[PDB]
Amino acid sequence: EVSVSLSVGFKTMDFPAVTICNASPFKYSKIKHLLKDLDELMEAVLERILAPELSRNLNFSIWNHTPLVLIDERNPHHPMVLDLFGDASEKICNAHGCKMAMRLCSLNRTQCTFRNFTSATQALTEWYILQATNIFAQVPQQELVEMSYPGEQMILACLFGAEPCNYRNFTSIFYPHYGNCYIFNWGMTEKALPSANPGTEFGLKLILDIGQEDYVPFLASTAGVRLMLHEQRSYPFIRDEGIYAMSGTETSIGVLVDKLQRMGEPYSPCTVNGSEVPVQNFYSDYNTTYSIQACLRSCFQDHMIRNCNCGHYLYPLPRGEKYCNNRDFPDWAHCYSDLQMSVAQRETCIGMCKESCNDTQYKMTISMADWPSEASEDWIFHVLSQERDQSTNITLSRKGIVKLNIYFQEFNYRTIEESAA
Template sequence: MVLKSPPAEPTLPRLCGDLLQHTTAHGIANVFRAGHWCRRLLWAVFVGFALCCALWQCTEMVLNYYRYPSHEKITLASNTVLQFPAVTLCNLNGVRYSSVRKNGAMSNSLQDLSLQQSRRRNKSSCWNSTCPDAPLESDSYPRALRKFASEFNQLPDKEKIAMGHQLEDMLISCNFHGHQCDTSFFSGFIHYKFGNCYTFNSQKTTDIRGAAIRGEALNTTRAGFVYGLHLELFIQQIEYVREVTHSAGIRLLIHDHAVTPFPEDEGVNIPPGTETDIGTMKVLIKRLKSPYGSHCTDGDGIKNFYHDVYGSRYTRESCKRTCVQLNIMENCGCSHWEFAAPPDLRYPKCNLSAVGVSECVELYGYKFAHGMLPCNCPLQCKEELYQLTVSGSQWPSSAFIEKFSSDLKEMGGQLSTIAESPQLIRDNLVKVVVYYQQLNSQQIEEEPSVSEIDLISSMGGLVGLWVGFSVCTLAEFFELLVDMLLYLLRRCLWKAVPHTYAKPCAEIGSPAFTGHKTTDM
């Protein structure tokens, strides 16, 4: 009987050598298969260079991924139904002249303002000549204008509403999508400069006085001039305060219904005596939150007085105005009427006639205008904008004005007083049409430039290019790792078990082991 020798015990060098000689990673196996030492050296240098290049480029990819780059994707979405935007309109004259004359303090302030305006003109006419009677003191017209505005904004909201232009007096005709509309389609708010402002399709349930109105959203199913919002407005130039309001017309904004409009910074002026057609296109912007570059927010954890007062959504502009209001409250001890302030904070409104208050408010207004306040106001993650195309024509036309004049006489009131004069009609009436140019909306969406899948795919491609690694190659090295762990485990167990025989094969030659019998000689 011939006994076979037991297989050689595996060792770590043998395990590693077997894998490296037969691995699917191109180049590594050639280091061990090369017959001459010079070829082995060249292959080793080349494989080392390829590994370094692969490691360098993979590191650059990982670092670029953690810079969180992004890009913008622009798409044009076609819609069969599109929500109509909110349309806010304000008379450029904030307070009616007849109401000012009934208020003693504002009437006196208006007289001071008129006097300062006359002095300002006289001083301006003497700018390039010698006028011995010219005032030497600094121009106080802006101070008088601020005083007039301050006294108006110190009044209770109910009085300010009553002093402003009323929608019932301004709205002559309203038509949306071919159907009549009235004042119940408009909500409102008080603006520190323009007085009463009214918003069509705001989706709020109360008007400027708190009365119930229609709050459902209005949609449009057709694009074009005919299916938009048609408004005819009476701006009441006879009620304009000449010392304050130097231009006539309507301030109009088109905006998202969920945000607070700021007429002093946004919108367009609509002059009287014209029909102004405003074609619009909706633009939806979506941004990525941190850690991407825009660092946008939905307003969580950020103080926003405009949400507290009006229930509006977070915007960067509302955050900035809240920030300056907080700074004025903390440092001046009052709330500025130019910015929103919740009544529960119990800060009095700033009286700019008081000593030191005007200088303090002006200081923080200057810092706000020049970006010097420490305000954390990132961009909003979702924003709706409306691109406008504005055109105009004379209205009413010479052929139509006679018929229109007779219609105004039948309406009565102040309208009947201007009906006889075509010039007064054109000086006091405004027509505006707001419509979608097409039922398409543009979407600008910020997207990650490198996703996790892109990173893994690019790294796999680089490693495959330089050293020929694939998923199967990784499986081979994983198998090697398992074999090495099993080898170490067997070694540990072999050392832990006591050995009865130091040389178990020493008994192979004995008679008892081979089964041979001994004979006596």
């Protein structure tokens, strides 16, 4: 039999690995030498919807990849499917019977299927994200990692406990949905630092610069720092675990480490280190520890490579394959949409990845206050502007700054452990 032991309280331990990403994947002032033509087309799509009478010589080879079509079914016996370009007033219909869709295609465009939306905001957002993915997937990552926010710009001041800290103290990685992400106290290249006291005095204290004036306007709909806590040497799946931190605000995050440890196969199906699972993990060249989300995201990429003969941009890539793009793999949009929307694929992979025996979690308590106060703005921003240690862009934006305090909560340790009776 298995007996459930438990304990809770406070304990000195390695401080969580914190990771910092800007919400926009790229600096628009640097990446717009690629996105120029797609933006020149996107503005025209918006003009064709919002104010048609104002509607040049666009790049329709970007459009013919997956054009948006108006569909209205308010005449049931004869629906009309209508491309926004190449066409009794000039308005697109927004009625309860009108829909908007992307005409995905395959096989020399002899077979097609619609990804279907009720709203122009979702339709345009998803169309642009797919097109921008097609653009980015053709750029070599050694160059693509230099068109996003440098740590030199973004981590404006840092202090752990009372020990100095700066951008070069973070381990950087390129996370393709967010650009450069910076990881503190990761515990891979060097020993991790402990935190022996509760409260903000002995946590991590950060001032960060969200360059909102330089966001990519059609990708970066949200402004903030995407933020996550995780154990040493594990990969940050910041897309679904991540907090947001708001600008002009001092965010204080109190941490409780809340583990649950299980026995293993002779009592429960979990895996201890991932050496036994059927599917190889493409995150191996990060040298991180095993985790079930890494296993799921390697199912998906393996099946993409199996079906479409290419790998998708948002995931790693085994050394022999190519990233999906419209030049090499014209059918990739359709081939990817099938796997993205197929629930059977999710089911057959969850039946293939065993979950880890150490369910470790961070039960954050988030608190917020306006910062800096009115009486102090005029000297805090002068000080910060005067010590950026770079000889350009003197005008530190007043509405882009964040401040974080991350600290162990009064009770910072809770653990559940299975024990043999």
